[PDB]
Each structure stands twice: as C-alpha cells, then as structure tokens.
Amino acid sequence: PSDTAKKFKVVTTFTIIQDIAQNIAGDVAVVESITKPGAEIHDYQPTPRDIVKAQSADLILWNGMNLERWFEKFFESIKDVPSAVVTAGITPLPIREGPYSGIANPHAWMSPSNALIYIENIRKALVEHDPAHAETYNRNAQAYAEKIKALDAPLRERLSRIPAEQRWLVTSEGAFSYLAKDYGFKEVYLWPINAEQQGIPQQVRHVIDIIRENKIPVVFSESTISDKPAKQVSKETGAQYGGVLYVDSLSGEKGPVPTYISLINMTVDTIAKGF
Ligand SMILES: [Zn+2]
C-alpha cells in the first residue's frame, strides 16, 4: 500500500473528534489529536511540540462553540494550514446559571443524533480539502453514521429500567446536557463548565440538597477533572459514587474507552449501572 507515501494529514484539537474523523478518513488520511487522552481540554496549555504537530497538517479541525478556549491563540502560530469548526448546524443548549449563563454548552457530541452532524461537517471538510478521496470519505461517513444511528435503540433500552421521575443525572461538569435532553434525564452538576472559577463549595451544598430531597441514588465525576467534590456529595448523602463518566476525552488505546462509540456506550452503561 506504501510505507512511504505521505497521506493527507488532519490534526484535531481533542480525542473525540480525532476518532470520529479517523473513521470517516479510513486508510486515506491520518488523523491526530493535539491533546492526549485524559488531558483537560477546555483550558489546555499548548506546547511547542503541539505547534509543530499542527503545522504538519493539511487541515485542522476543532469543536468551536468556544470549547477550546486556547485554540484561536494557538492557531496564530500556524501558517498556511486551514482550520474548520465541526459544529456548524448544531442547535446550542445554553448554560442556565452563574456567570456563564447563556453561553453555549459546547458538549454537543454527547447526543448521538448530534454526532450525525459532526460526521457530516467532517465529511464536507475532508471532501473540500482532499477531493481526490471524496468517494472514500463519503462511503465511510455513511457507514459510520449508520453505526451511530444503530446505537439509539440499545442505548435507550439500556436506560429503560429507570422510571421518568427517577431520571436524575448528577455529574461534576455539566457536560451531559445534550445526552440528558436526548434520553429524558434531569441534569444536576457541580459546575456548569470547566474553568477556573468560584462557587463550587456553595454548589456542593446545593447539590447535596437536591440529592436529599429527591433521594437520588448515584453521583458521578468525569475522566479529566477532580472526583473530590462528587465524593464529598456521596459521603454526605444516601447517594453512592458511581463515576467515572467519559465526555471530554477518550482513554488510551489500552484503556476502557478507546473510541467515540465506546465513550457513548460506557457513559450510558455506567449511568444505568449506577441505578
Ligand atoms: Zn467539558
């Protein structure tokens, strides 16, 4: 097939988009993520090796919706490589309280129906910038979208033993708003979006309140942030610590969450197991 031939190179900001894009690209392009699995993605601090990586790319993809607060500054260091957001056509859910009230929640990929839009935007970008391989990108995008569509029934079935009134999803970052909307959960979080911020101790008390009044049985944390506030809530309440949920990062390839599909599956399975 050729060990020497330089393939079209895509660099993504973080691992979820890398894996979605690699499924669309197949063996016709190579996709690499800037952030490493487990690394916090909202306020990531790029290195000089990161600049070298993106400079080597033919196309740079990012979430937008101000997810990657570092990206626009990072992109100043890149010359003559185009960049594209992958969330065009996504309906934002706003953050509802605090100093980020009204800012778009950037975690749109946790809705599998939204992931179809991610796939379409990535397909368009790949076809635009590497048109010689359009048939491969289109074939692959269609087959991957069908895989994602086929998740809806098993995911809903996996959550089907939790009656509507009990469907409370208590997490650390409020990163699950789109998933909660899709599957009919009421979200509760310890902070509305990852950031250096005040007010988490106050919110811990508020969440203990909500847990106690609704007798919610489980609370979670996520793979790139601290599990201490979540475990503070579980200690003070009848709720068990059920975490860890995956949203901002895949695991390593040898870890429990190597792919975007595995991420959606593991997050849903862990929620269901909590109940
Ligand atoms: Zn996040």
Curated annotation (Swiss-Prot):
It comes from the Bacteria. GO terms for molecular function: metal ion binding. Transmembrane segments: none annotated. GO terms for cellular component: periplasmic space. GO terms for biological process: cell adhesion; cellular response to iron ion; iron ion transport. It is found in: Periplasm. Fe(2+) binds at residues 42, 107, 173, 248. The keyword Transport applies. Coiled coil: none annotated. Keywords: Ion transport, Iron, Iron transport, Metal-binding, Periplasm, Signal, Transport. SUPFAM superfamilies: Helical backbone' metal receptor. Part of the ATP-binding cassette (ABC) transport system YfeABC involved in iron import. Binds iron with high affinity and specificity and delivers it to the membrane permease for translocation into the cytoplasm. Also binds Mn(2+) and Zn(2+). Monomer. PANTHER family: HIGH-AFFINITY ZINC UPTAKE SYSTEM PROTEIN ZNUA-RELATED, METAL-BINDING PROTEIN HI_0362-RELATED. There is a second metal binding site (site 2) involving Glu-128 and His-129 which can bind Mn(2+) or Zn(2+). It is unclear what its physiological function is but may participate in protein-protein interactions with other metal- binding proteins. Belongs to the bacterial solute-binding protein 9 family. This is Iron-binding protein YfeA. The gene is yfeA.
